[model samples]
Target chain A: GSHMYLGRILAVGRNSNGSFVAYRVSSRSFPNRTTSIQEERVAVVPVEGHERDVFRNPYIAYNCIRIVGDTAVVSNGSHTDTIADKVALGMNLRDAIGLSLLAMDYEKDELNTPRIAAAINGSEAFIGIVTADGLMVSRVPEETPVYISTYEQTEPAATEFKAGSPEEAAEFILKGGEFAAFTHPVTAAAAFNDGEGWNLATREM
Target chain B: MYLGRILAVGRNSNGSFVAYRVSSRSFPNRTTSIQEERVAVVPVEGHERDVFRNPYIAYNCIRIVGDTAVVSNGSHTDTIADKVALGMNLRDAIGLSLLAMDYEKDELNTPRIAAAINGSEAFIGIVTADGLMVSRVPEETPVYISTYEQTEPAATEFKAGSPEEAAEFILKGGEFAAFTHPVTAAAAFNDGEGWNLATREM
Candidate 1:
């Protein structure tokens, strides 16, 4: 396949072993972003000096992955912290997520990209999105990789999610499988439930 | 606070709302001067060219965007004011400005601090090697932030009745002077109408 542009979000994938993974496919209108493994989170920060690029879009930089207890929560914006803090307050993931999506709503950016997120606890995993019109969420299937993006595939759907580890999942999402073919693949990062805790990886192109 | 550099903002008993800033240094070769209604941080004596070698050595520690005034420990002061001039809200202005420049990529990963104050409102911010924090301050409550220990805004006893008094307060207040090596000071006050600026050199 040829290159494509999706400006993707957490196109979530859940494999047969029941591991829920979060993947991203970034594009060019906004590029030069990278992930750094910080002490308590996986931060998506702007390239230094280029940090002002965030002025063009408030949602451009944030911590995409935050590990709360045994739950691994991932998202495309600051709501990632909101939901994680909600869970930290003893609220269940379902409620923690529900409160964030509705209260914050979608961003008021020019295009109003949907906010995509997913959470992987021990046995259950959920993928959700808040868009210009409404919100949608679904339990990730135990059979294949499911997806929800900030654009294009803004709904949850399943596809061939072929990867063995967190690192491989990130590669497949940007280079190998169905999601990878979507254009502009600026960079991608992934995280999966290690069955014990969260294991995450990063990629750049 | 003996923190590396300090910024204090609030109204005192006499009602002059102000932004106060002080420079504390390991290399004391700089001075503050009021230039074009702003305080320019400059290297003194034969050390004038040192500014280019360490760009952080020289900057407008205080600047204004119409009625709102901003102050910082480094060059970020100008960017924050420019963003505000572009119609960006206070928080976003301060945030994007700080994030864009990043905490100085120098050896210390030097922390950055700033405050934007109008006659009616004020906001303070800081970004360090470990984290970032920003706050909306209320009336009459003086808040102080620093590059080190007090990275976040905390209520303080520091206050002043005029721009000159504000400069002196931040420059030699018991709390700030205790840290040692005080080099320069700058202050801006909104007399409920326009911003009047002042500076001090030691």
Candidate 2:
């Protein structure tokens, strides 16, 4: 009933407070990774002993989560930075997600890794994925948790993400629901909006 | 201001119902053809291949069922009319069709605009990348909505004269005088007993 290896996952939904974007870095290759929070972003970078891992693959480290204005973006790769920039620059949810995914395509790794992303703001939310097949972006409904990953759960389908605060949500994303079934869990970063403002948090193992 | 494909819904000074569409394009070689109760926008003879390039270029722009008339940009014209003909209300018909079709799957992601008008009431609707909007417009206040530039339904001082003039007037007439690049126009007016349709080309 659950995927054993989701690679990386992006889940978007709203709790009783407001919108939430949950991102998890579930990796088999680079398991000794951690997320560090900067000015307005939380980046997934290799820890002390895994410094040379970035040379193996550029996507192994990226700003997996960012908040610009009221918009929050979570993705499996560096496209997270561009999507946040576009949203702050007045691109609609659909355009920001679609165009970024198109330009980035899927990761060029040996697995032909699919790229997944989710965005949420006060008014709207969306989930997207790009694969060898093509790109897809769709609007997310209210209260229903929908997620897509770099592996078999490639489409944005309804899943269960128990509601919590931004910090609590990040902890849950790092070890909750189907995500807990995965063999390796790297780190998680979450952004939650309650009225018109957003709070962000990260959890690493 | 450059309003893209648009639909204007309202009433004349004499309280006649009006459903008008103006096709403003960056794509050329397009015109409108009228036949009885339906009007179609299509590519001209030599440019028939244009339809292959963009399927949105060719579609039924007008369709009438009994007293109600449907007008739109893109193929939702028939869908709205067909759903309304099957006894559905105009709002639900517009919502279902536009949401199901979504925005045009083109490079620009062009939105879909539509209108439905009977003897006494009229409504306007649009589906964009952001979301769906369907509004029941006031009968006396002529309002127009576009696929691009002008997204929201805007009230204009457009006169609903005859079907022919209504088609022509929307191109550089009244509020549209401030806009440009109109390729084709179609208008349908309710005359109490039935609907009258006409088309004009730039």
Candidate 3:
């Protein structure tokens, strides 16, 4: 079976190298015209020659990744900025993610896609989802990072294997067997907290 | 069948103003009344609360953050505030928020309305199934505004006034809709001292 149109996976636990890492997975069912990966964000931009087709679609684009202060915020929609803004306001990571997710509720598009999001601050991370059914929030383990996408309703599943580096992680998510048939060209970003400081990486299609 | 809801903002001789009006032909006939801080388009205090109501039409219509203020018709008001806190530009932020929420999924295909007020400058926008419409206005000039129909700016004799006066004018002025229900409004005023707010129910 095909996954939902905009499936995404975010990993916020630590990598093998012991750096706190955050990764965003981009996938699509439609053609790869409306979305692009920018330096700090994955944007849903206007696709030329198909202006009307673009608006007919519910996925109006925005920054799917943003670094607000020291926290890396990632989400399927505008909830990315909403959560990032709340975290910067001195609110706790858990509350910031929960409030913003609940506020957005879910995508109003015909598909009723669930709005998924994650926030990684230092070594800790939180994931939240809002769907037609209700809202869910959980603290992902710093050692074992499992995630949910717009597709798959099972438990937060773990990857069969892990990437050796941030770039490898991006490649695996974009072209991996888990998402190959369902996702568009991969556009991913990573932020690593190595105890001493932070490093960031962005990959484009 | 009249246009459902409206969110508007404008500058006046005295200061700047923002407004939220709920015109309904539905069971809940309501009006806007003045409240604390910012204004709201709430159900009348004693109204039955329309058990199966659309939450989009009833919400905090205005908010003051530092030197900036926000006015909107739905929960996106909070979304806009959240984005602004992250340093999003008022113009682009409004477009982003509106696009994220294209329109109310309700049966009527109701439009989502909002406006932003930063000092004396103002930006107004609406999102419907058709698309988005936004107009930025200056301190003394009137911009064309409408809920569902196309509109032109006001006549030369029509000049911006005080916040209270502007609220009254927008609430009462013109032949807005054929099946007009109760009208409620909230306005922001910069009285040189600080930002002051007022609401009225009609």
Fraction of true contacts retained by every candidate, in order, equals: 0.00, 0.00, 0.12
TM-scores of the models, in the given order? 0.55, 0.55, 0.50
Off by over 4 Å in 3: A1-6, A18-29, A34-42, A46-54, A180-186, A195-205, B1-202
**Number of residue pairs clashing in candidate 3, backbone atoms closer than 3 angstroms, sequence gap of 3 or more or interchain:** 2
- Give per-residue CA lDDT, model 3, range B62-161, as digits (tens): 7766566787766677667656655676776677777655566567766667778776467777777777876676556544344445322222222335
In angstroms, the error of model 1 at A113 is 19
Which is superior by DockQ, 2 or 3?
Answer: 3
**Alpha carbon deviation, residue A132, candidate 3 (Å):** 0.8
**Residue A7 of model 1: what lDDT?**
68
Tens-digit lDDT track of model 2 for A1-205: 3657878988998866567898888887788788888888888899998889999888899998899988889999999988898999998887687667756778998989987898988878988887754456678977687888899888777877776578878887788776677658888888877775778888877
lDDT of each: 0.72, 0.79, 0.59
Q: After superposition, how far is residue B157 of candidate 2 from its true place, in Å?
A: 52
lDDT of 2 at B139: 57
Ranked by DockQ, top first: 3, 2, 1
* lDDT, candidate 3, A96-181, per-residue tens: 88876765666755667788877777647887788877788888776676656765642355654356555655555556646455
Q: Tell me how each candidate scores on DockQ against the true complex.
A: 0.01, 0.03, 0.08
Worst 10 residues of 1 chain B by lDDT: B15-24
Candidate 3 chain A, run of 10 with poorest lDDT: A49-58
- The local lDDT score (0 to 100) that residue B200 gets in candidate 2 is 76
